[PDB]
Design a protein around this ligand. Structure first.
Ligand SMILES: N=C(N)c1ccc(NCc2ncc(-c3ccccc3)[nH]2)cc1OCc1cccnc1
Length: 222
């Protein structure tokens, strides 16, 4: 995450860190004690999920680790266009809820009224390094018309755009699958955006979570 700052220690109990062969790979969102939501492009071998983390470089008494027993990529995910970039991960070991491990409720209304939005992750910072402490930034939803002009023919109804006109606060490599939180509900998942990261003109592009209510419910209930 570029141009942000360290998150408050208690503000992100729904944040997951995803690892593959020891590499920090992606972020994720705890939505149910058995399920973590992330981007379909985070599909990698033997995924390991860490909940209750704040600083990746130190062992924390609140952390909980789990392997993934099932990975469910949306049937219509298109890797070339990033369309429908969503995947459900079933945990081997259900989350032991605490003050620092809690699920985040989903935004179900695609016409939801404007609320305060934020993004978070352990992705690449402004200097180009990967931070130990999770970064946070306030950002705002960008109109569909402005986003379409920023990325002609690339923005679908399954994508939302968000950014910051002042500093260009943006998600980046490694933040993938992390949450775009608006009014204490999950509004989007980190999917793609500009290179280099920075949202002053070309906003970050997020999976539009409100479009996946039925698919998420049907996956968790089957
Ligand atoms: N600027 C952003 N808001 C932004 C946020 C997250 C990501 N994640 C990386 C990522 N998304 C999708 C793929 C992918 C999909 C299919 C196949 C292989 C790869 N990889 C990228 C972002 O912007 C582009 C970007 C790329 C690389 C380095 N820096 C910025």
């Amino acid at each position: 995450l570029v141009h942000g700052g360290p998150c408050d220690k208690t503000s992100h109990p729904y944040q997951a860190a995803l690892y593959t062969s020891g590499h920090l790979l992606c972020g994720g969102v705890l939505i149910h004690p058995l399920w973590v939501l992330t981007a379909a492009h985070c599909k990698k071998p033997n995924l390991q999920v860490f909940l209750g983390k704040h600083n990746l470089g130190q062992q924390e008494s609140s952390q909980e680790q789990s392997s993934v027993v099932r990975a469910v990529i949306h049937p219509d995910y298109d890797a070339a266009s990033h369309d429908q970039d969503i995947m459900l991960l079933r945990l081997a070991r259900p989350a032991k809820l605490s003050e620092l491990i809690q699920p985040l409720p989903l935004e179900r209304d695609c016409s939801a009224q404007t609320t305060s939005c934020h993004i978070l992750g352990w992705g690449k910072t402004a200097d180009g390094d990967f931070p130990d402490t999770i970064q946070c930034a306030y950002i705002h939803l960008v109109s569909r018309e402005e986003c379409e002009h920023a990325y002609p023919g690339q923005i679908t109804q399954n994508m939302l755009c968000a950014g910051d006109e002042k500093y260009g606060k943006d998600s980046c490599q490694g933040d993938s699958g992390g949450p775009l939180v608006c009014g204490d509900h999950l509004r989007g998942l980190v999917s793609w955006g500009n290179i280099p990261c920075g949202s002053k003109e070309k906003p970050g592009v997020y999976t539009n979570v409100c479009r996946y209510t039925n698919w998420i419910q049907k996956t968790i209930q089957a």
